[PDB]
Design a protein around this nucleic acid. Structure first.
Ligand SMILES: [K+]
Ligand SMILES: [K+]
Ligand SMILES: [K+]
Ligand SMILES: [K+]
Ligand SMILES: [K+]
Ligand SMILES: [Mg+2]
Ligand SMILES: [Mg+2]
Ligand SMILES: [Mg+2]
Ligand SMILES: [Mg+2]
Ligand SMILES: [Mg+2]
Ligand SMILES: [Mg+2]
Ligand SMILES: [Mg+2]
Ligand SMILES: [Mg+2]
Ligand SMILES: [Mg+2]
Ligand SMILES: [Mg+2]
Ligand SMILES: [Mg+2]
Ligand SMILES: [Mg+2]
Ligand SMILES: [Mg+2]
Ligand SMILES: [Mg+2]
Ligand SMILES: [Mg+2]
Ligand SMILES: [Mg+2]
Ligand SMILES: [Mg+2]
Ligand SMILES: [Mg+2]
Ligand SMILES: [Mg+2]
Ligand SMILES: [Mg+2]
Ligand SMILES: [Mg+2]
Ligand SMILES: [Mg+2]
Ligand SMILES: [Mg+2]
Lengths: 97, 42, 112, 51, 95, 55, 118
RNA sequence: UCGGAGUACAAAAAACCCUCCGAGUGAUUUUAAUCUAGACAAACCAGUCAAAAUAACCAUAACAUCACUUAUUGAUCCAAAAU
RNA sequence: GCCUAACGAGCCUGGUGAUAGCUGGUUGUCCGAGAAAGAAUUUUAGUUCAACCUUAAAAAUACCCCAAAAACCCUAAAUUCCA
RNA sequence: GAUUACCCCUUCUACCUUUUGCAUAAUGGUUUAACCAGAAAAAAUCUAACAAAGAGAACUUUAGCUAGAUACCCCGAAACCAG
């Protein structure tokens, strides 16, 4: 067993998890040409690629959403100064003052 | 027009031995025999 | 012994609040039904003979706490107001319906 | 949290809208499949013989 | 309901349904409110008006009455000066 | 009552109704019978379209 | 009667010693979650079952990545006793389009872009 | 069988041969119309509200009231009365 | 009491395949989805509706759901509603 | 399950019916052969003919009409009436 030790060292808890004992091809032709890939290995490399795309998609949406909020904050302030620089010069009591 | 008639020359002759009803026209009947339709018969 | 209590069985009348704040209601929808005066009617809200509140105009239902000024012809209510100390005012809850659709619009029907 | 409640207001809504639209499109394509002559004329191959 | 009669072998109808229901060609059935002739002095003005109004029947009641009557009463009829003649067909029904 | 290349008829229908709906309509082709089935009520539009083509 | 449990906001106030104990960053919160389900939805109320279903945690011991926005955190707090949550670390940064197929997620919670080169 | 309070503490619903009150109608005149949007309630049958419009009368007049006001009630068929 | 080995009323045949909400039985393989009870009822050993569910079909929104919001003497866990 | 080896070892509370729940000390069966129990097309869905019309008369018709396919058991009372 000893899964706690393996997790401490960075390896998988189960020795069948993404270790060098699993990823590498178990058999090859004698002459030296590579063997056809395993069905399991190809499937395992499809969910990892799918997982990586999800991380990139999630990271970009959060960053893009943050940018939109900053734009609105600047837009709100720029609109406020527009009203100040668009009204008329208050004459009122300042004419006699 | 009927280009399917060209295909009939290659195919064997149509007789009573090879005739099939239109698929879906005859839903099969279910009889109360077996584990599924059994011991209560619905 | 024997049971003395009789007639205790009666189904509920489903008295309660129907439309919460923010619901879009049309004219005639019953906003709420009640036994006693729990919510008083407000703007654009009628009042039936059985004290049910129904919206009069199409719009958004809103709930509000406002002051209470009773009708002078209501002897019991005006007496309660009379005995209050000078620093107090009655507060009650009200149901409003802010209109959404305008009354109407002007359109060109004929250009002579 | 990384973002506050206000900064996440509708940050990812086009994807949510597109996901629902894809669901409607796939569910609206439900229709009987095409019927071709090869399926009907392929039954005559039952009695194929060696002459 | 007599599914198979003993004389002709056809499907009979229940005369109770026809004497108190009207079937429109759209499938909807028509009926009177219960108690529209009993103790009128006791009921209020609004209640009497409600009891004097024709009403429709829901799906289960409509489906029930279609299995109790034969196919003669579901036909299309063109009566002269029929008040319900314009209600026979449904219109603008987006289901 | 369609004779000939039915798939030509289906393609001509698809791009005829595409601008009206914004999407390709769902169709069924029945070569054993010669019948094209289109999902929706387009009978009036199709009758005018076939009349212009002279069928 | 048994009903939902309301978690007071005083629970989620971290002590100054919490950051050093769990290896968190005192100033900048992490960006992405890694959620792994541990226990079972059985013998638990129905509202906890739906939250597990709608978070993609149907299969146990399978990591799933979620954002750190309050909307996701609101649902995680309900089922925080059925899942394991670890931060997502990026020693080499976000993967590019060239290295999508070589990514591997280690147990300690870091995503290695280039795995078993050559 | 029907209503009110608690059990049923805060939207609705919720039981017992569970704990306590009632109803099977009176008093009075303001004798309370016709027609229709939209809703509450509900297995069904039933029950409830209701703007606009028309008539009645201040000549641009609709909630019968009071008694905890909530309950004061009965489906077809059939019978009798003017219809 | 007895009337051909069973008499609170004989035996045989016919009506008779009497009728049972009650008990027992219900015959090949494999696969998909899958329900514990709200309302009336000489009704609670049963039926007919509603809910739930199955098969097919159409359509757009469903769950989670922040702030605001829901009673007057005191009142917990918490519900309703909603981006 | 195995095993060089039949046992020895290890692991498993008969089967249907009926129930909230049956190894139950709840029901039935000694075993074998033969015999013994789902049946109907009004509305509907699937396939096809022809289509504002369909059907080999009599009818149905605001996309309908005609034809086919898909359906709903067996054994048992005490009794009642006539000859
Ligand atoms: K069965
Ligand atoms: K019974
Ligand atoms: K026994
Ligand atoms: K028994
Ligand atoms: K048995
Ligand atoms: Mg069947
Ligand atoms: Mg059969
Ligand atoms: Mg059996
Ligand atoms: Mg009760
Ligand atoms: Mg009570
Ligand atoms: Mg309702
Ligand atoms: Mg008025
Ligand atoms: Mg009767
Ligand atoms: Mg004898
Ligand atoms: Mg029998
Ligand atoms: Mg029961
Ligand atoms: Mg049902
Ligand atoms: Mg809230
Ligand atoms: Mg919503
Ligand atoms: Mg046991
Ligand atoms: Mg028992
Ligand atoms: Mg059972
Ligand atoms: Mg036994
Ligand atoms: Mg027994
Ligand atoms: Mg025995
Ligand atoms: Mg039929
Ligand atoms: Mg008799
Ligand atoms: Mg006799």
């Amino acid at each position: 067993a000893g899964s706690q030790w393996r997790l401490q060292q960075g390896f998988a808890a189960n020795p069948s998890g993404y270790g060098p004992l699993t990823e590498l091809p178990d058999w090859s032709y004698a002459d030296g040409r590579p063997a056809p890939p395993m069905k399991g290995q190809l499937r395992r490399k499809a969910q990892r690629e799918k997982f990586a795309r999800r991380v990139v998609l999630l990271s970009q949406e959060m960053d893009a959403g943050l940018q939109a909020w900053q734009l609105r904050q600047q837009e709100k302030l720029q609109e406020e100064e527009g009203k100040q620089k668009n009204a008329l010069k208050s004459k009122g009591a300042l004419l006699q003052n | 027009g009927p280009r399917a008639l060209d295909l009939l020359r290659a195919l064997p002759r149509v007789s009573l031995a090879n005739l099939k009803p239109n698929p879906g026209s005859r839903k099969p009947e279910r009889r109360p025999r077996g584990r599924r339709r059994g011991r209560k018969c619905g | 012994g024997s049971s003395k209590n009789l007639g205790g069985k009666s189904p509920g009348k489903r008295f309660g609040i129907k439309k919460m704040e923010g619901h879009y209601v049309h004219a005639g929808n019953i906003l709420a039904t009640q036994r006693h005066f729990r919510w008083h009617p407000g703007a654009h809200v009628g009042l039936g003979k059985n004290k049910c509140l129904y919206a009069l105009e199409e719009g958004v239902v809103r709930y509000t706490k406002e002051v209470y000024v009773p009708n002078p012809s209501n002897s019991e209510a005006v007496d309660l107001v009379t005995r209050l100390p000078q620093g107090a005012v009655l507060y009650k809850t009200f149901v409003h319906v802010v209109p959404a659709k305008p009354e109407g619009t002007f359109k060109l029907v004929a250009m002579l | 949290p990384f973002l506050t409640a206000e900064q996440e207001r509708g940050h990812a809504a086009v994807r949510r809208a597109a996901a629902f639209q894809a669901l409607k499109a796939a569910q609206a394509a439900r229709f009987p499949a095409h019927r071709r002559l090869e399926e009907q004329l392929g039954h005559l191959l039952v009695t194929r013989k060696w002459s | 309901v007599t599914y198979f009669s003993s004389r002709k072998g056809k499907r009979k109808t229940v005369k109770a349904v026809i004497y108190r229901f009207l079937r429109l060609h759209s499938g909807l059935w028509l009926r009177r409110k219960a108690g529209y002739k009993k103790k009128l002095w006791k009921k209020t003005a609004a209640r009497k008006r409600r009891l004097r109004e024709f009403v429709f029947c829901n799906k289960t009641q409509s489906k029930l009455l279609d299995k109790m009557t034969t196919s003669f009463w579901k036909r299309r009829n063109w009566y002269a000066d029929d008040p319900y003649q314009k209600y026979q067909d449904r219109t603008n029904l987006k289901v | 009552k369609v004779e000939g290349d039915i798939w030509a008829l289906q393609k001509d229908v698809e791009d005829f109704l595409s601008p009206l709906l914004g999407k390709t309509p769902v169709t069924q082709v029945n070569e054993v019978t010669g019948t094209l089935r289109v999902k929706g009520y387009f009978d009036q539009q199709l009758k005018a379209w076939l009349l212009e083509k002279g069928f | 009667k048994f009903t939902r449990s309301r978690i007071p906001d005083k629970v989620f106030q971290p002590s100054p010693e919490d950051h050093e104990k769990y290896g968190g960053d005192p100033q900048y919160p992490h960006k992405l979650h890694i959620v792994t389900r541990i226990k079972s939805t059985k013998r638990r109320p129905y509202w906890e079952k739906d939250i597990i279903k709608m978070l993609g945690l149907e299969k146990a011991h399978t990591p799933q990545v979620h954002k750190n926005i309050p909307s996701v955190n609101a649902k995680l707090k309900v089922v925080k006793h059925l899942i394991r949550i670890k931060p997502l670390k990026l020693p080499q940064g976000l993967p590019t389009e060239e290295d999508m197929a070589n990514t591997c997620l280690k147990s300690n919670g870091e995503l290695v872009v280039r795995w078993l080169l050559n």
